[PDB]
Design a protein around this ligand. Structure first.
Ligand SMILES: *[C@@H]1O[C@H](CO)[C@@H](O[C@@H]2O[C@H](CO)[C@@H](O[C@@H]3O[C@H](CO)[C@@H](O)[C@H](O)[C@@H]3O)[C@H](O)[C@H]2NC(C)=O)[C@H](O)[C@H]1NC(C)=O
Ligand SMILES: *[C@@H]1O[C@H](CO)[C@@H](O[C@@H]2O[C@H](CO)[C@@H](O)[C@H](O)[C@H]2NC(C)=O)[C@H](O)[C@H]1NC(C)=O
Ligand SMILES: *[C@@H]1O[C@H](CO)[C@@H](O[C@@H]2O[C@H](CO)[C@@H](O)[C@H](O)[C@H]2NC(C)=O)[C@H](O)[C@H]1NC(C)=O
Ligand SMILES: *[C@@H]1O[C@H](CO)[C@@H](O[C@@H]2O[C@H](CO)[C@@H](O)[C@H](O)[C@H]2NC(C)=O)[C@H](O)[C@H]1NC(C)=O
Ligand SMILES: *[C@@H]1O[C@H](CO)[C@@H](O[C@@H]2O[C@H](CO)[C@@H](O)[C@H](O)[C@H]2NC(C)=O)[C@H](O)[C@H]1NC(C)=O
Ligand SMILES: *[C@@H]1O[C@H](CO)[C@@H](O)[C@H](O)[C@H]1NC(C)=O
Ligand SMILES: *[C@@H]1O[C@H](CO)[C@@H](O)[C@H](O)[C@H]1NC(C)=O
Ligand SMILES: *[C@@H]1O[C@H](CO)[C@@H](O)[C@H](O)[C@H]1NC(C)=O
Ligand SMILES: *[C@@H]1O[C@H](CO)[C@@H](O)[C@H](O)[C@H]1NC(C)=O
Ligand SMILES: *[C@@H]1O[C@H](CO)[C@@H](O)[C@H](O)[C@H]1NC(C)=O
Lengths: 200, 330, 50, 138
């Protein structure tokens, strides 16, 4: 509250830098780009695999009945009906592999929306570098994009600390904080921010 | 009262990369096959692409687990951390390999001519991060979690005395910080006694590293049965290709080796498909080890029985062959 | 006068079907990298070839 | 024979001296290129071969690659993944740009040429640890 004008100004500059960050580097959406590229380049080989002879005399079955007879066609078409058969099984098996990799990533993104977005996460480095504050989801083609608003300490100052102090012949431990000294006097302060307080 | 227990936990991170080429495995040293092998199309580009992807991501698994800090910290020369003895996990500079006394056991209890007897078109690529820089990353993690605590994982490293970092680890448990100071001589003595048993129990049970022993056993044995099918006849006359052409006519051989060119190709397709199963298990375990490193090491976890059985205080990573070993202090 | 031999090429067609450019697949490693990548522009990185 | 049951040791029919059979040297060829939008010079890595076995074959009609002038190229450098031909080894370390293997990462530096170097993991820092000193952000 004593720093809200600074914090709100600091947040607006950070969220404006996101649009410049994504629009610059091309590898920004590569997570989603290789998802659609792997699907397209697996369909392309599946289409091109029927253009191969598979050890037969031709790649089309209508030609191998006009220029070749019926009894041995069965063995000629069997060499081509199993080449496209194994090519379709190869395509399906790689699709189950990719679906398991996607579902393991969609289960993570459902966990990210449940924890980073619907609450404040105490799991460090789960929802971005630094102490988590809140997250904002954004939609994307075949994916989701988060905006992890975090809290990064800066401008650290060295200090001299003590575990406890003894005043009336008995030890005194801080309740919520740490004893520090600026060289002359002793103060109690928060662990993650510097506000000196009189030892009370 | 209480006791402080150190429990080890071993997780695979990456497996051995490999690469199979198209023609030399199937019909190498045979120019009469390579024109006939073109009659399949995407038979082997797909296999090469899949194995290269299994390999590219084997370097991403090691990068996302160990390389989590942009700054390589180093330990101070003064090795008095509050009476706690950290000699077993900080690196030993007297050894030529800058590894801890515990990492030296782990790099001796895992075994791989074995990789070089598979030279039939099979090439085992080396990892991008070599062995002496993975342990450099682990030393950078240990030099931060002792001097700075959890503060290096969330911003600038902010130094703190270790007897006091453990008071904040005690405050997360549910006990106040006065129990750590009134008993630090006992706590520091109990921690070093518990960390001494890790050096003995790791070299006692043989199957302690069975988690990393079978990730290299499964990859080497599947490599072994891959080259064991080059002697497979597949219903032909001879398993050797050149004796088929010389001792049999040109028309019959092309169809005769057509079942030797797809029987041996389906043996290669079975190996690639089995690698995609095994890479997914490792990638599911590398993301688990990255979660352990980002939460148990870079902070204090409130998750029950995640970073060790008990109330988790703070953990240490240790490098390992094709994996990582965590030392959970509970 | 020049001699033809069996060579593999990559031909770039325009929208009107004319051969606007071509690249050999056996001249130098950059050309065979373009030939095995099926692109006249190659991004920065490592690529496995024959 | 061996574990894989391959013929790897024979005895000559004349005299009783023994001979060892190791197969002919083979390996993949990997190029180390920047973008073609950037300069068109490349570097070539021969994967997993001894590098004294490549420059014997600087001739015509002798290998699966057809180029001859590139084998007499820049300075070779035996890494742990074969030798890299076309890029020079540079002592100081930077961050990885194009990964090669066993710590070697090539990049395009300054005239301009492709150089190879060992990876730099990060900036070296020493935390000022003391048993009575703490650091608190302001
Ligand atoms: C460590 O922190 C303490 C607390 O702020 C510092 O003590 C304070 O020092 C300033 C000037 O150095 C004092 O301000 C002036 O003091 C004179 C004394 O006669 C007074 O007449 C003025 O009106 C003005 O207040 C301040 O009073 C003093 N605080 C207390 C409680 O006495 C100390 O200097 C710091 N040490 C460092 C930075 O090394
Ligand atoms: C507090 O500041 C720094 C740490 O933030 C302490 O160490 C100095 O900074 C670097 C850290 O290694 C060294 O290169 C300097 O030489 C250090 N300075 C000295 C004088 O040793 C610094 O010592 C601390 N100062 C005080 C007054 O506590
Ligand atoms: C908590 O348990 C520890 C472990 O037994 C106790 O430490 C021992 O205490 C006895 C007597 O108090 C000594 O004779 C032993 O030498 C101590 N063990 C070690 C390893 O030094 C400790 O006293 C217990 N705490 C309380 C409050 O009883
Ligand atoms: C930390 O533990 C190590 C391991 O026990 C200690 O090294 C031993 O030190 C004693 C006495 O100096 C020797 O008798 C042993 O032979 C040492 N063992 C080894 C393996 O070197 C070390 O002294 C301990 N350090 C502290 C500060 O407690
Ligand atoms: C036949 O085999 C014999 C030995 O089995 C060979 O005899 C040796 O030949 C070498 C050189 O030719 C001599 O240095 C040895 O002293 C010979 N040994 C004996 C026991 O005679 C012989 O070379 C082979 N070939 C022919 C054509 O005889
Ligand atoms: C292709 O044909 C269209 C139709 O006339 C023309 O506008 C265009 O310039 C042509 N492109 C060429 C010749 O490159
Ligand atoms: C090509 O390089 C120039 C600078 O040399 C750069 O401005 C441009 O964006 C690059 N284009 C692509 C497609 O990489
Ligand atoms: C490569 O060849 C050199 C010289 O012949 C030799 O010293 C070196 O040991 C060889 N390396 C391997 C791995 O065989
Ligand atoms: C580069 O390093 C090598 C060995 O690491 C050394 O022999 C050589 O003198 C170094 N060159 C320079 C200019 O430092
Ligand atoms: C810090 O450790 C050194 C060496 O063990 C010791 O001389 C010094 O008194 C210690 N500082 C405090 C405040 O106890």
């Amino acid at each position: 509250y004593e720093n809200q004008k600074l914090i709100a100004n600091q947040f607006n500059s950070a969220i404006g830098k996101i649009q410049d960050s994504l629009s610059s580097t091309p590898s920004a959406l590569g997570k989603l780009q290789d998802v659609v590229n792997h699907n397209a380049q697996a369909l392309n080989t599946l289409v091109k695999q029927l253009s191969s002879k598979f050890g037969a005399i031709s790649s089309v079955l209508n030609d191998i009945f006009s220029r070749l007879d019926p009894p041995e066609a069965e063995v000629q078409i069997d060499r081509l009906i199993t080449g496209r058969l194994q090519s379709l099984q190869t395509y399906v098996t790689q699709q189950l592999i990719r679906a398991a990799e996607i579902r393991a990533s969609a289960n993570l993104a459902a966990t990210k929306m449940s924890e980073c977005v619907l609450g404040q996460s105490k799991r460090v480095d789960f929802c971005g570098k630094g102490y988590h504050l809140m997250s904002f989801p954004q939609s994307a083609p075949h994916g989701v994009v988060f905006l992890h608003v975090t809290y990064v300490p800066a401008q650290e100052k060295n200090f001299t600390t003590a575990p406890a102090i003894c005043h009336d012949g008995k030890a005194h431990f801080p309740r919520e904080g740490v004893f520090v000294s600026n060289g002359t006097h002793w103060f109690v302060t928060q662990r993650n921010f510097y506000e000196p307080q009189i030892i009370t | 009262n209480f006791t402080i227990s150190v429990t080890t936990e071993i997780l695979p991170v990456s497996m051995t990369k490999t690469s199979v080429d198209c023609t030399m495995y199937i019909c190498g040293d045979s120019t009469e096959c390579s024109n006939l092998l073109l009659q399949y199309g995407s038979f082997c580009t797909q296999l090469k692409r899949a194995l290269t992807g299994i390999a590219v991501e084997q370097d991403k698994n090691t990068q996302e687990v160990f390389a989590q800090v942009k700054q390589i910290y180093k330990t101070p020369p003064i090795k008095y951390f509050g009476g706690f003895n950290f000699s077993q996990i900080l690196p030993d500079p007297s050894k030529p390999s800058k590894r801890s006394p515990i990492e030296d056991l782990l790099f001796n209890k895992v075994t791989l001519l074995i990789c070089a007897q598979k030279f039939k078109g099979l090439t085992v690529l080396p990892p991008l991060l070599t062995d002496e820089m993975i342990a450099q990353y682990t030393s950078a993690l240990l030099a931060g979690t002792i001097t700075s605590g959890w503060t290096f994982g969330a911003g600038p490293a902010l130094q703190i005395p270790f007897p006091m970092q453990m008071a904040y680890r005690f405050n997360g448990i549910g006990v106040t910080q006065n129990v750590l100071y009134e008993n630090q001589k006992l706590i520091a003595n109990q921690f070093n006694s518990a960390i001494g048993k890790i050096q003995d129990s790791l070299s006692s049970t043989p199957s302690a590293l069975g988690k990393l022993q079978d990730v290299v056993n499964h990859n080497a044995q599947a490599l072994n049965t891959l080259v064991k099918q080059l002697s497979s006849k597949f219903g032909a006359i001879s398993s050797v290709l050149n004796d088929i052409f010389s001792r049999l006519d040109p028309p019959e051989a092309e169809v005769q080796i057509d079942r030797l060119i797809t029987g041996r190709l389906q043996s290669l397709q079975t190996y690639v498909t089995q690698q995609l199963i095994r890479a997914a298990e490792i990638r599911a375990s590398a993301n688990l080890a990255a979660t352990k490193m980002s939460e148990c090491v870079l902070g204090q976890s409130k998750r029950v029985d995640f970073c060790g059985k008990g109330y988790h205080l703070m953990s240490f990573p240790q490098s390992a062959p094709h994996g990582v070993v965590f030392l959970h202090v509970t | 006068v020049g001699y033809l031999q069996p060579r593999t090429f990559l031909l770039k067609y325009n929208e009107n079907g004319t051969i606007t450019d071509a690249v050999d697949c056996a001249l130098d490693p950059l050309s065979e990298t373009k030939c095995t990548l099926k692109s006249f522009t190659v991004e920065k990185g490592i690529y496995q070839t024959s | 024979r061996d574990i894989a049951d391959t013929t790897d040791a024979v005895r000559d029919p004349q005299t009783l001296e023994i001979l060892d059979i190791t197969p002919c040297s083979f390996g993949g060829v990997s190029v180390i290129t920047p973008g073609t939008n950037t300069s068109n010079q490349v570097a070539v890595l021969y994967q997993g071969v001894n590098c004294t076995e490549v420059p014997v074959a600087i001739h015509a009609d002798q290998l699966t690659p057809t180029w001859r002038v590139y084998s007499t190229g820049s300075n070779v450098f035996q890494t742990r993944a074969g030798c890299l031909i076309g890029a020079e080894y540079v002592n100081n370390s930077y961050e990885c740009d194009i990964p090669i293997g066993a710590g070697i990462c090539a990049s395009y530096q300054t005239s301009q040429s492709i150089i190879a170097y060992t990876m730099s993991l990060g900036a070296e820092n020493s935390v000022a640890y003391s048993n009575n000193s703490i650091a608190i952000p302001t």
